[PDB]
C-alpha cells in the first residue's frame, strides 16, 4: 500500500532494456541515491526529465 500511487521524480540517470521492456533509472525527490530504482516506461510520467537525460548523452 505504501508504495502505490505516484511519487515525484527528481532525476532520470540511465536507461536499460530488460526482457523487451525499456526501464529508466530514477532518483526520487526527497530520497537519497540509495532509494534509486529502475522503472518501466509504462510507470513514467516525466517526459521533460527523460528528454533532458537523452539530450545530455548526445
Amino acid at each position: 500500500l505504501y508504495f502505490q500511487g505516484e511519487f515525484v521524480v527528481e532525476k532520470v540517470l540511465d536507461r536499460r532494456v530488460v526482457n523487451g521492456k525499456v526501464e529508466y533509472f530514477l532518483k526520487w525527490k526527497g530520497f537519497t541515491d540509495a532509494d534509486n530504482t529502475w522503472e518501466p516506461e509504462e510507470n513514467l510520467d516525466c517526459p521533460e526529465l527523460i528528454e533532458a537525460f537523452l539530450n545530455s548523452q548526445k
Partner: peptide
C-alpha cells in the same frame, strides 16, 4: 500530490 514529473513504483 504530484500532477507532473512523476512515476509509479514497481514496488507498489
Amino acid at each position: 500530490y504530484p500532477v507532473k514529473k512523476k512515476a509509479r513504483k514497481s514496488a507498489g
